[PDB]
Amino acid sequence: AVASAYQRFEPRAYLRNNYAPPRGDLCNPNGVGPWKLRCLAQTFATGEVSGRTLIDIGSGPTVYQLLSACSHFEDITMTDFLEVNRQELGRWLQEEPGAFNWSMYSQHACLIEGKGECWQDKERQLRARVKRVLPIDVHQPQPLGAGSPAPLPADALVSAFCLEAVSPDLASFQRALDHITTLLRPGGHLLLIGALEESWYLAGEARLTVVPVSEEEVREALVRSGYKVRDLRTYIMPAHLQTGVDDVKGVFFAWAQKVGL
Ligand SMILES: Nc1ncnc2c1ncn2[C@@H]1O[C@H](CSCC[C@H](N)C(=O)O)[C@@H](O)[C@H]1O
Ligand SMILES: Ic1ccc2c(c1)CNCC2
């Protein structure tokens, strides 16, 4: 019944707690922002994660997870359980009034990528390759998509801070991973980002209860769902980024491959 709590979920409050200074201050490489974008950039740069279609699970109201990604997939599908978020994304996609400012992220994605690309061009490419923003439920065996417009099976998947924050225990987590794994074409690629050993986090009036997992549980979960863990790293949250919006211990990045056998 996490969904009950997600009802009071305030996108703007979420964005302010996680993507605005101090966490959203991308000057200083020892930060989470830099590190997350770095993991993403380095993985795609290997040019092994490629194709035509891509799906972002539980996008929430953020876009940074697709910045380096868009350069490799012409058809990008963003998703999220809450409508308030799907709406929040739209303000940025359609450049509506009061959309969130991802300038800094776009810029650092461009710095890290080193293609001499300007942020305006990248944001333009992301907004372009994002075809639709569909509603999704990782808890359903067929992720809120009975006959979804999304091209299936996707050639790759990306998820940042979703699963751990939607499931109440390690088992839900595992099943949710299985669910989404079904959307991934065999031999496909998965880029998983999430909170390590986190139990709760605020988002306005909402107070989400989440499953504290470990780099090892996640790895196992990945292997159990039928993946070849290509890369798995962990960033330890510094004291300075430990504000009172949650109790994260660290953050993990996972590059997994749907092993086709
Ligand atoms: N059952 C469910 N299935 C999929 N997404 C869900 C869900 N229940 C809640 N969510 C959404 O999953 C998100 C997790 S937190 C936001 C994650 C975002 N990718 C980021 O990095 O900031 C929230 O936006 C929440 O509304
Ligand atoms: I750093 C970072 C980014 C996103 C989120 C958290 C921490 C903690 N709560 C889930 C959302």
Swiss-Prot record:
GO CC, any one term: cytosol
UniProt name for this protein: Phenylethanolamine N-methyltransferase
Presence of the UniProt keyword Transport in the record: no
GO molecular-function terms, A-Z: phenylethanolamine N-methyltransferase activity
Effect of residue 246 to A/N: Strongly reduced enzyme activity towards phenylethanolamine. Decreases affinity for phenylethanolamine 200-fold. Decreases affinity for S-adenosyl-L-methionine 3-fold
List of residues binding S-adenosyl-L-methionine: 14, 19, 58-59, 64, 80, 85, 137-138, 160
Keywords: Catecholamine biosynthesis, Methyltransferase, Phosphoprotein, S-adenosyl-L-methionine, Transferase
UniProt-listed Enzyme Commission number(s): 2.1.1.28
Family, per entry: Belongs to the class I-like SAM-binding methyltransferase superfamily. NNMT/PNMT/TEMT family.
Mutagenesis / variant outcome for changing residue 77 to A: Significant decrease in protein expression and enzyme activity with octopamine as substrate
Matching Gene3D superfamilies: Vaccinia Virus protein VP39
Gene this protein is translated from: PNMT
A biological process term (GO) from this entry: epinephrine biosynthetic process
Organism: Homo sapiens (Human)
